[PDB]
Nucleic acid binder design. Structure first.
Ligand SMILES: C[C@@H]1C[C@@H]([C@H](O)CC2CC(=O)NC(=O)C2)C(=O)[C@@H](C)C1
Ligand SMILES: [K+]
Ligand SMILES: [K+]
Ligand SMILES: [K+]
Ligand SMILES: [K+]
Ligand SMILES: [K+]
Ligand SMILES: [K+]
Ligand SMILES: [K+]
Ligand SMILES: [K+]
Ligand SMILES: [K+]
Ligand SMILES: [K+]
Ligand SMILES: [K+]
Ligand SMILES: [K+]
Ligand SMILES: [K+]
Ligand SMILES: [K+]
Ligand SMILES: [K+]
Ligand SMILES: [K+]
Ligand SMILES: [Mg+2]
Ligand SMILES: [Mg+2]
Ligand SMILES: [Mg+2]
Ligand SMILES: [Mg+2]
Ligand SMILES: [Mg+2]
Ligand SMILES: [Mg+2]
Ligand SMILES: [Mg+2]
Ligand SMILES: [Mg+2]
Ligand SMILES: [Mg+2]
Ligand SMILES: [Mg+2]
Ligand SMILES: [Mg+2]
Ligand SMILES: [Mg+2]
Ligand SMILES: [Mg+2]
Ligand SMILES: [Mg+2]
Ligand SMILES: [Mg+2]
Ligand SMILES: [Mg+2]
Ligand SMILES: [Mg+2]
Ligand SMILES: [Mg+2]
Ligand SMILES: [Mg+2]
Ligand SMILES: [Mg+2]
Ligand SMILES: [Mg+2]
Ligand SMILES: [Mg+2]
Ligand SMILES: [Mg+2]
Ligand SMILES: [Mg+2]
Ligand SMILES: [Mg+2]
Ligand SMILES: [Mg+2]
Ligand SMILES: [Mg+2]
Ligand SMILES: [Mg+2]
Ligand SMILES: [Mg+2]
Ligand SMILES: [Mg+2]
Ligand SMILES: [Mg+2]
Ligand SMILES: [Mg+2]
Lengths: 185, 51
RNA sequence: CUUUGCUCCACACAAUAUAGAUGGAUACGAAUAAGGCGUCCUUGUGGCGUCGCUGAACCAUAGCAGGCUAGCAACGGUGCACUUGGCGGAAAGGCCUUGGGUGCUUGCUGGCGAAUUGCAAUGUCAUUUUGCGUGGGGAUAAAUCAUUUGUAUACGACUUAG
RNA sequence: GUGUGGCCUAUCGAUCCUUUAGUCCCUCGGAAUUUGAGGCUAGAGGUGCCAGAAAAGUUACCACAGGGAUAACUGGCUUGU
RNA sequence: GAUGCCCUGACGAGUAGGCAGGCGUGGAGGUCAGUGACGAAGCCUAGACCGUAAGGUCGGGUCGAACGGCCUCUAGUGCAG
RNA sequence: UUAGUGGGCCAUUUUUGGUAAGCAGAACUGGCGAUGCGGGAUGAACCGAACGUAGAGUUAAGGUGCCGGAAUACACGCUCAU
RNA sequence: UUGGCGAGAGACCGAUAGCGAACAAGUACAGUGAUGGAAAGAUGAAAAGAACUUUGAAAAGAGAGUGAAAAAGUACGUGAAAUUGUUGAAAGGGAAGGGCAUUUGAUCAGGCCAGCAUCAGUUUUGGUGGCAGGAUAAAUCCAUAGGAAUGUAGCUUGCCUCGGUAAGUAUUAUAGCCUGUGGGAAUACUGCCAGCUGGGACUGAGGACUGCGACGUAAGUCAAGGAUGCUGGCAUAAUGGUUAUAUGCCGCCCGUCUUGAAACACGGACCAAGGAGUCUAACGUCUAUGCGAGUGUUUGGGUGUAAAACCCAUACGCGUAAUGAAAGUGAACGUAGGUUGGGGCCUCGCAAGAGGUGCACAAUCGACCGAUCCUGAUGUCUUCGGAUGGAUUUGAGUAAG
């Protein structure tokens, strides 16, 4: 016998591979597993872990978010890398030049980047240009902006959204939501 | 692949501890202490034997 | 009294299968704050001596698993078969004894043999039970059913008779 | 300075409905005015089974689902009596 | 065969329950130009082999017309009550 | 994010009711329930110890006349019970 | 459009299924009646459905024959299990069955079984050597001072089986002892050795090299990152498997509810076959996939090799805006803010670090939009308008989707 301080046979609880059966994503993972092992660059370890993430943990990155990032001081000529999809945003007018590396470009995003003189590249083309992540800038989309997150942690006084199909005057605005009808929240 | 005990395997003893060759040669496990002629005080003995 | 059936003995030849051979189960009785053995005599609940302190004994024990031979010394030891007389009924089935015969003798001294089972392999040696075939002896019935009885009885059983 | 009831520790009440106070404000959806009705904010009318059904018995004529979660024997622990 | 190969260290009880990887059945798409009247399927078999196991495979007997492996799809898919 | 559960029961110590209970009710911990294994002849809960499949060694608790593996061990006393 | 008539189909069921009904089935049968309502498919290609002989009163048997086969005979494809007969094998003192192990018998598939030496790993049991400590063991022993009694010699009395002694006395004498003090050792006990050797048992994982060492002047060698060498017998039921039995020890009956089941709690005589988390509408989390500020071809139209596949306009749904009961109003002071953290990147450093930039995300202070409560400008259908500025108030909000 052994007085176990921890739980035995506990899996790490991190993905160690994409759950996806996309062949081409599996090739990207074969590449970045190689570079992460054989270089010392922190970048490659990060990009490798990002290729494992589920769709909800790879939120899209608009081109306005890329544009905002290149306004950072000393950042205008960095390769922006998005381990995921770059979407268009018609809320910006002037987009800078720049090279963006990503898994996917929407048709509109690829148009807007190219029209400004830029270049959209795959993550394997990034590997050859920047094997040690040289001169890159990793961007992540916003995670906590999903509709589902509005509803997490629902409870008295917590200020979260109820799970509700129909909204209006008659749907969950009475006893419990105002002092005049029993009490508020 | 196989833990050898220094305390049995003489080769492994020497690997871990180069002084073991010296220690054995000079027989430091059986060192004679130098004779001294110290005697306890009366008081020490008188209390030792006291009823 | 004819499948020559039964039995005993001797001898083969098969099988059988072992509650577990592997030098020897080697005989007083009684006491234990007492005895054993020897010895002596007034024979005793005797005198004297001696022993124990475990069988760690005693006996046996050498030889091709024990061969083939030649002598010496004793006339002893021992095996086998056969005889003589006796004792043993607790479950005697054994103990002892006479006599001659025939082997063996490591009591002592010789000669010849042994190999190759290859550097070990239980390396086979005992003891049951039964069959079967040879030769030699020996013996020459019952019970049951059916019938019958009523001292017996549910049926078996029992008790009778032929 | 003290004072948003009682020196402190108990002394009390949702939704729906009604009703009052307040704003004299929003609505009556073809367009107006005036009544009426409806809303918004704060109270009261009460649920004492007090997180709040609107509620009398009998069955030996009895029924069903179950219960050894539970009585009416024995047995067991206990031994007051 | 990188879902591979390999090195190192630690650990292993389990009802209710959770999750994972597998085994088996009817039927569907694909494939093996798969097996088969020179014997398919089924059944019997103190004969053999593989797998921790679900199970799989082979021989012998019986028999007479169909049936399997693999990649997938799908369910009226596994019994001791 | 979702399952099961929402009858518990026992031991040591603290503890209430009760003459008491293998009774009723609390406290802290450990257990049984859900758990085999060695020991306590036997036994849910006690003692030891928690379990992949094997080999060797050593031990726990409990034992060593015989049943039964292991001293009819050693040592000082006590005890004879119709 | 679960009826009628006529068609075509199916990832549907395959005779306990599928309609109750594959068949002379709404039949046979039950009930006064309304009603209730089964079971039951398969010889063979072909009846070629067994002439004839023989036993028997006959049914039938035995032959003969037909047939590819009667191991297809109408009691008819295959022909399981429960349960049964016969034969063979085996065991059996108040159940049987099971586990671990081996003996014995039977049976069966594809190098097998051992011995010694030298090593390594783990361990068990002996022999023996050197040291350390302590009151530098204590003792014994030797020397010396003092002492007494369970008083040795001597002596004195009394007994005198005539040395047996009884009592005095005497402190080493013809025995000895005790205590103290000196002296020199030894031994025990405890501990240490990178001291040396003998015996026994279990293991031999790994599979080119690579390491750390040791020994040697080197060359090399080695017991140093896991067993080799030498030898024998057998080559098959010999080892081993299986199986039955025997023997030692152990082993209550499963399923279930329960704090607690072997229970004197419930279900279960046996066997086959059937037999229980499904489909749908709308949803939550999570995951995959497509496209992405959008997205969704399938109501319908076009087309077709025809329920498929292919193509498509307008809408509509959800999303891209909230808030308020409502009338309504409706999201940048700023580099879409500040502060603290923050992966990664950039610069400088052999590196440690130092500095810069900091996405996601977390905490916090602000700002923006709507509600509520205040404030109430210029104006003016003089009661409308509602600027500006506020507030321990509030929202399922904004703040590069
Ligand atoms: C006794 C009287 C009436 C009572 C109340 O309206 C009774 C209602 C409650 C409800 O929600 N639904 C009903 O159908 C009955 C109330 O409020 C009291 C103060 C005054
Ligand atoms: K363990
Ligand atoms: K109540
Ligand atoms: K009633
Ligand atoms: K009493
Ligand atoms: K197929
Ligand atoms: K719960
Ligand atoms: K619950
Ligand atoms: K336990
Ligand atoms: K026990
Ligand atoms: K222990
Ligand atoms: K006994
Ligand atoms: K039917
Ligand atoms: K047939
Ligand atoms: K056997
Ligand atoms: K039950
Ligand atoms: K009952
Ligand atoms: Mg109107
Ligand atoms: Mg209540
Ligand atoms: Mg009860
Ligand atoms: Mg487990
Ligand atoms: Mg089906
Ligand atoms: Mg066949
Ligand atoms: Mg069988
Ligand atoms: Mg046919
Ligand atoms: Mg089913
Ligand atoms: Mg069944
Ligand atoms: Mg069951
Ligand atoms: Mg629940
Ligand atoms: Mg409750
Ligand atoms: Mg309950
Ligand atoms: Mg109780
Ligand atoms: Mg339970
Ligand atoms: Mg007891
Ligand atoms: Mg014993
Ligand atoms: Mg039917
Ligand atoms: Mg046939
Ligand atoms: Mg048939
Ligand atoms: Mg049968
Ligand atoms: Mg060794
Ligand atoms: Mg064997
Ligand atoms: Mg038993
Ligand atoms: Mg109960
Ligand atoms: Mg039970
Ligand atoms: Mg009982
Ligand atoms: Mg019941
Ligand atoms: Mg029953
Ligand atoms: Mg039944
Ligand atoms: Mg079935």
């Amino acid at each position: 016998g052994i007085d176990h301080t921890s739980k035995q046979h506990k899996r790490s609880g991190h993905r160690t591979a994409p759950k996806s059966d996309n062949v081409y994503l599996k090739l990207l993972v074969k590449l970045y597993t190689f570079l992460a092992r054989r270089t010392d660059a922190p970048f490659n370890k990060v990009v490798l872990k990002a290729l494992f993430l589920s769709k909800i943990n790879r939120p899209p990155v608009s081109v306005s978010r890329i544009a905002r990032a290149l306004k950072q001081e000393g950042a205008a000529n960095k390769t922006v890398v998005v381990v995921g999809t770059v979407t268009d945003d018609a809320r910006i007018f002037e987009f800078p030049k720049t090279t963006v590396a990503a898994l996917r470009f929407t048709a509109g995003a690829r148009a807007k980047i190219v029209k400004a003189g830029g270049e959209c590249i795959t993550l394997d083309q990034l590997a050859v240009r920047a094997p040690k992540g040289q001169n890159t800038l990793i961007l992540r989309g916003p995670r906590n902006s999903r509709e589902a997150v509005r509803h997490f942690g629902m409870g008295p006084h917590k200020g979260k959204a109820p799970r509700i199909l129909s909204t209006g005057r008659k749907f969950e605005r009475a006893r419990g939501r105002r002092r005049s009808k029993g009490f508020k929240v | 692949v196989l833990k050898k005990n220094p305390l049995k395997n003489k080769q492994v003893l020497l690997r871990l501890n180069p002084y073991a060759k010296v220690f054995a040669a000079e027989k430091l496990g059986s060192k004679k202490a130098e004779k001294t002629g110290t005697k306890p005080a009366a008081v020490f003995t008188e209390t030792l034997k006291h009823d």
